[PDB]
């Protein structure tokens, strides 16, 4: 019931409010269909310079940062509405370039819509401090101001969703933006550019420069007119972002059935879930065997196949590189004596590849697959006896995107929540971002600086 | 080793920086020694008017509110230091007028010293908001300002400690203050007036008017120049404060020994504890009998007697009224079929009266001693089967000063903490205020108002 | 083009979700038309008890406070939408009972709609604190909780608008509410009850008990089951609210034309203005004569007459009492030697009375009309030479609702803004609440308390 | 009266609590005396690895981050006290390595002491949020946690003062620290290491690795175990810091005498001033000539010479590089037609070099000395007619450390304060950091991350 493009769609890139024609082009085929779908400009360092100049111009001339926050919120809310009307179109191009199941793409869009609405509300709440207690001759205050021109680099796994977790909050403060998405998943980033123009965003406030990391990414990192650089793949600030080896710590006193469900939902896509992959299971030894059996039974129901089938839960491998990493990973795990409990293969389903939901158990932290990282429904199980063992296994990575703990014991739950390094933590619930927030309070502040002001008499 | 006054000490009251002689006087004898100890002025409505006028004058003329917060903090910290040097003197007069054990009085003083230091720090942190996001032609902000002249009425049970939980925070914002302490426990409130003068508080910022509720209290409640009226016994704001029927909810999955200790410490005075009386025990039926036995064993070790003995843990009954309430209470409890498990009597120990640590069990919420309230080491035990039964028994009062819950189960702990109405909550710990705080963040703000400011271009 | 009621409309009062029939009734005629318009129940003390019990029941049983904030916001936003659909109906009954110009009533409604929307957003943002820095064995936090059952008493001058500045913020935290509006202006408060039922507010969350101050007001102030009592006319908290002698301070270095416009708008109703009456002018002596002439010229253009005429700017006197106060006031001002510059009379325009815009100059602060207060477009002008004279004249009242200052000099503007006691301050702009806010940040918190929570290991 | 070292003092570097011997060494002579004063280890990449490992170990093992904030504050306050006792010793080594006047060094130390005390207080106030309004089955909160291991690189101009503006706030959150100071001004950074050991800082929490930017700096920027990298000269975050071309905007309606004083104090060192160099003057054309004459008269009183003379206000040139930049700068300014109004030379005063206070006027923004930057008492004056001209000249740099404006006009003051990009702003006062703060509220938060926590039932 879903027709592929008759000819690959050629995009332009987006600078200072207008579409721009590419010279050279990256040809992208559908990971699930092996059919040409898009043609993406490979921009030059000179193109990125123009995008930065446009964003500079739009920041400094007052057209965005000088507006009242209400006007910025109005644009963001209109974009949210347009994004809702065009949900099926954005999901379609996302599936085509990334392999994602359509139901997961549509669910990510709903989370994206909500991000636009949070950013809009938070634009109005942004505030600083007054110091009225310095005595009669002296008055102090702190103002919050947009950081300025923000460079954003997004990755290929969650191209649209990471963009919408960042871009609307960046724009809400009055910052301007230049985005470089991954060469393999650029279409939806450009469709967002169109949405924001249609919503009334002034020219130069949102610019998309497509192309390679070697050319456009490097020009971005070395540009001396970008105030802040934010990498989610990978001049005052540069932020980086961390890995998807998100651990799930399960204790014997927990609800093992709910916990096993959460492991299953955290590795596949289920309705009402959105966007928190997990790849490490950390389970009390005395229940490891029963719980792992629970998880394997659920993992073998996960539906794999045609991403345009609304019931698919695992989509196609996005790049040919990701394909060798997975078969390498599994080979390494077998070699080092990790026990494969299910999956382990890549399914050739027609003209696409699909990773089987896969679970290694008896994994020691010193093994090579405990260090290495992969994207895909591949899960490694570690066992522990003590609370401090669980925490040390959980913390064995550099820093975590997400984490969760299952336990009815308040001391164990709190100890894990406080001592495991992750940005988002779930306690006896499914890790999900779909049907106040921290991003509601703080997403906008992240792209601001403070100005202290000292007024005598 | 402790000598009583040879003659009762006659205090003056304190208005606009100077001591003032009484005309009529309330003669106060030591609850523990039946010996005259103090002579307290019974002030007139005209006296209170002068105190309010002085506090009005000192607020409006800039001598306190117009200073920088640093100057207010310096005075408060100097008072804290003076309060430390005079700890033994303040404890002595507190014991003499109130019957409190000396070790409890000294422990309350240490908490009072810490209140002065918190208020001093919070004076500097007090702040409002800036709205820099209204566009270029418009600037908004919120300022915090002292409410103005504050009337404070304190009670006889914790006369000095309630004063120091309020007064330094009131003064820290720039408010001025008129205090009416209880006629039976006024001495330490006047010694604080002396301390604050010695610390350099300007005249009229702290005024003490002693006398009866009928005369000075009524003039205070009806005065139309007091900006805020704060009753802890009992013109924009009037605050009241609530009861000491603080419940302690104990679940079967808790550490019953620690929980029983907390009940014992919460009813007596132990070293390292300060100031959270508890009087209702709410214990899961399946462990009620074992736990109550644990509590009775500890209650019968509580040392009762000479309050100047540093080992005493329960002091003398403060007023003759409180004496009939207790014997009435216990009589009522027996009549309605509550089971007395220990205590029940008042000990005539020389020239003083002392309430035995007392525990009724098998108390239904409909009984009359569940409604009625008493001060003294008198404890009533209710039994429950479900979480919601515990919460409903805990909430059967109007509103709680404090509460605690003992449970290893995170859902039960959180449900009780969120749904039981109390201002301060302990979870698997002893209720105590002795060896960031909420009072650190919020004590000063309570006596401020906000001014919104809207500036065009 | 506007038809009066054929027969006066008989309202019921509103308790626990249902309309209730009165026994005795207050008959209300239109201040502008001298025609019966409404019939309002005079409720009993027993009626108020039932309303409090219903609000108690609805607070304690979880039907409102236990919902997520999102569900409370959804109801408040639906009520805002219903209030928009019924704007003409609510304006009509407001005009009929109060005499207000229809354009002012419609403008107040728009401000009311915005209050509902702010409260809805703020319901979601309400938050407390975590203390993660107490060490490994200890965790602290502060929770915000609804205060509980709130009693609200509203006045006859801005009956609907004061209600909507309070009620949606009270409801947003999870509080429940009992309202007693002024006997002469009750209709719109009951129409809001209908709106909130139609928006899906659970039963007992909003209750309206009409009747006299002597009966229903007294029962309310003395009720021991109301957690907070808020008077805007006139158990832990009681708030009062202050007067409409809002001063406007004009300096010689200001834009005298804009400043004079602001005085004119602040005394009448103009399009795009909403709801900040001003009644004291404080003007630098060296420009007092020129500026007062500017103000008189604008005051004599103010349109007076039929409140259903959309061009009327001053409506009918609301009560027969307010009528003698005005003629008394003006008589007093003449007797004491204040110079009448314009107005001074009450116009009998058909079957209604209308206060002429009136301006006394040469008013010394010691005069009796400087003390006395009136509602109506009656303005008194004081003169000053120094910044501190202006501030002392401005502060000569108890506490101010609003204030403004006109000056290009940053030191004079800031000195007046900081040292004049008012809740809302305008600087070189028109005082208005019509076409982030302080009420956005703080309106909801005002009806909450904090619970500190201390969790060991 | 001040004796130089008989032999240059050889320092070790500081890793994991112990002093470490160098292999190769940088020999440093006094800029003012041309006498050997210090011998600084040139550390290896391997040395930096050990420092990072030590800081890693000390962060992860709980010895610092796991303490209560009170214990961290106690160490920081003890260090503040030790820093006070050793003020003369730290000033002495600072003067010796940097050339700074002794009175400026002692004044910077006092600011450093105050930074330690702010950080100590802020350690206790650090807090996150609770979301109690998600309904009964759900509880949310945000925690603040130390970012982890922080790399800090400091510059040679304010070596000790920049260190103390950063290090105590970094340590206050529980972060651990590795510092690389400038090779020419390392001594005081190592003396701070000694101070912190003497104050009881655990091993590995503060580590100093000295040496070159090419070796130790590069190893630091490329190290993959540093959580945050902070450059003030020049893995989730990297911060940079901006220039000292701090503009001072002077309007004709200002107090030209006070404004001229502020320019003089902002370029030299005066008693009661601390640490805000300014180098661009932006003055309304109609008063440019009178004001510049005012500034030149004050600039020619500035005392230049022996930095150990307590009256010196301008010290010796720190490096031989800075020496050619200055004579180049002045040469360029003459060539492009900027008018030299005073100074222009480097004084050879014995065995040291000293920059004369120097003021170019008639500088157009397009000139090369408007772009170029220098450190030294060298001032360039631009002229403007309109508010927007002043703002555009002020903003012609990348981003400002500080800025100030002189004007009695509230619209001009506010327009400049809001639209000029600087982190710290003064309005009609001297730019100074010497005898609540923004750093008090925010310095500690800068080295923290937020963890959102979502707890179901």
Numbering used by the authors:
A (entry chain A), B (entry chain A), C (entry chain A), D (entry chain A): 7 to 240, 256 to 456, 469 to 490
Reported in the publication:
Finally, L‐sorbosone is further converted into 2‐KLG by a NAD(P)+‐dependent L‐sorbosone dehydrogenase (SNDH). Sequence analysis showed that the SNDH of G. oxydans WSH‐004 belongs to the aldehyde dehydrogenase (ALDH) superfamily (ALDH‐SF). Like other members of ALDH‐SF, SNDH has three typical domains: bridging domain (Red), catalytic domain (Yellow), and cofactor binding domain (Green). The crystal structural analysis found that the SNDH could exist in two different catalytic loop conformations, i.e., the oxidizing SNDH (O‐SNDH) with a closed substrate pocket and the reducing SNDH (R‐SNDH) with an open substrate pocket.
The first structure of SNDH with the addition of NADP+ was identified as a monomer. Although the overall structure of SNDH is similar to other members of ALDH‐SF, a significant difference is that the substrate pocket in the monomeric structure has a “closed conformation” Because the substrate pocket was not observed in the surface display. This closed conformation results from the extension of the catalytic loop (Ile288–Ser300) toward the outside of the protein. A disulfide bond is formed between the catalytic cysteine (Cys296) and an adjacent cysteine (Cys295) in the catalytic loop. This interesting phenomenon suggests that the catalytic loop of SNDH has motility, which may be controlled by the redox states of Cys295 and Cys296, thus regulating the opening and closing of the substrate pocket. The closed‐state structure of the SNDH substrate pocket is referred as O‐SNDH in the following parts. There are two missing loops in SNDH, loop A (Thr241–Asn255) in the cofactor domain and loop B (Glu457–Trp468) adjacent to the catalytic domain. Therefore, the electron density diagram of O‐SNDH was observed, and it was found that O‐SNDH also existed with tetramer as the basic unit. In addition, the dynamic light scattering shows that the particle size of O‐SNDH and R‐SNDH in solution were similar, both in the range of 11–12 nm. This indicates that O‐SNDH folds as a tetramer in solution, but it is more suitable for analysis in the form of monomer structure.
